[PDB]
Amino acid sequence: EAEFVRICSKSYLTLENGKVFLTGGDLPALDGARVEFRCDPDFHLVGSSRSVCSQGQWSTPKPHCQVN
Single-letter amino acid code for the residue at 56 = G
Host domain of residue 9: 1-68
Residues 31/24, Cβ–Cβ less than 8 Å: yes
CA–CA separation, 4 and 14 (whole Å): 22
From the CB of residue 65, how many other CB atoms can be counted at a distance below 10 Å?
20
Residues 27/8, Cβ–Cβ less than 8 Å: no
Structure solved via: NMR
Residues 37/14, Cβ–Cβ less than 8 Å: no
Tally of domains within the chain: 1
CA–CA separation, 16 and 20 (whole Å): 9
Q: In the chain, helix, strand, coil percent, each to 5? A: 5, 35, 60
What CATH number does residue 11 fall under?
Answer: 2.10.70.10
Comparing C-alpha atoms, which of 38, 36, 48 is closest to residue 17? 38
* 26 φ/ψ angles, rounded to the nearest 5 degrees: -175, 125
